[PDB]
C-alpha cells in the first residue's frame, strides 16, 4: 500500500537488501537487471539479493477529513505538479550543471596550462639565478 517507489498496491512487491520498500516487478527486475542497484536508495544491490515478502512494508501518515475531491483533484494536481516540478527542476539543474562543468573543465585545462607555463618560468628563473653567480 505505502511504498517509496510505488505508493500504491503492488502486484508483486520486491524489496532491496540495502533499503526495504515495496517495488514493482518490472521496475526492480528491469532496473536491477540493466544495472544492479537499489532504485530508491541508489545503493548497490543484486537481483538475487532482493527480499521476498508477502504484503510487508511500513505505512505513511495522512491528515483527517479524507474525501474524494481532495484525493482525486488535490492529490492528482499535487502529485503531478510535484513530479513535473521535480523533473523540470532536475532538467534545468542538470543542464546548468553541464554548463558549469564545461566552464570548470575550461578553467581546469587553461589553469593547468597557465600553471605549467608559470611553473616552467619560475624554474627557469630559479636555474638562471642559481647558475648566474659564477
Partner 1 sequence: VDALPYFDQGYEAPGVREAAAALVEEETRRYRPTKNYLSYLTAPDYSAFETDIMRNEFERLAARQPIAWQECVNNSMAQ
Residue 93 vs 123, nearer CB to its own copies:
93
What is the gyration radius of the CA atoms in the chain, in angstroms? 27
Please check whether residue 45 is in contact with residue 59, taking contact to mean a CB–CB distance below 8 angstroms.
no
Cα separation, 96 vs 101, in Å, equals 8
User: Which partner in its own copies, partner 1, none is near 124 (CB below 5 to 8 A by kind)?
Assistant: none
Contact indicator for 87, 52 with CB cutoff of 8 Å: no
Integer Cα distance of 15 and 24 in angstroms: 9
With CB under 5 to 8 Å by kind, the binding choice for 6 among partner 1, its own copies, none is: its own copies
Could you report how far apart the first and last alpha carbons of the chain are, in Å? 87
Backbone φ, ψ for residue 5 (5° rounding) = -95, 5
Binding residues among 105-124 for its own copies as defined by CB under 8 A:
none
Tell me, by CB under 8 A, how many residues bind partner 1: 40
Taking CB under 8 A as the rule, does residue 66 contact its own copies? yes
Is-contact 23 16, C-beta < 8 A?
yes
Contact flag: residue 32 with its own copies (CB under 8 A): no
The verdict on 71 binding partner 1 (CB under 8 A) reads no
Q: For the CB of residue 12, give the shortest distance to its own copies in the complex, in Å.
A: 8
Within positions 79 to 98, which residues make up the interface with partner 1, using CB under 8 A?
79-91, 93-95, 97-98
Contact with its own copies (CB under 8 A): which of 77, 107, 119, 123? 77
Task: Check residue 75 for interaction with partner 1 (CB under 8 A).
Answer: yes
Amino acid at each position: 500500500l505505502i511504498c517509496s517507489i510505488s505508493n500504491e498496491v503492488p502486484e508483486h512487491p520486491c524489496v532491496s537488501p540495502v533499503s526495504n520498500h515495496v517495488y514493482e516487478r518490472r521496475l526492480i527486475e528491469k532496473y536491477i537487471a540493466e544495472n544492479g542497484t537499489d532504485p530508491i536508495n541508489n545503493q548497490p544491490l543484486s537481483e538475487e539479493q532482493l527480499i521476498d515478502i508477502k504484503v510487508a512494508h511500513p505505512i505513511r501518515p495522512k491528515p483527517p477529513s479524507a474525501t474524494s475531491i481532495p484525493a482525486i483533484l488535490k492529490a492528482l494536481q499535487d502529485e503531478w505538479d510535484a513530479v513535473m516540478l521535480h523533473s523540470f527542476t532536475l532538467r534545468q539543474q542538470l543542464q546548468t550543471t553541464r554548463q558549469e562543468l564545461s566552464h570548470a573543465l575550461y578553467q581546469h585545462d587553461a589553469a593547468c596550462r597557465v600553471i605549467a607555463r608559470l611553473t616552467k618560468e619560475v624554474t627557469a628563473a630559479r636555474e638562471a639565478l642559481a647558475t648566474l653567480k659564477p
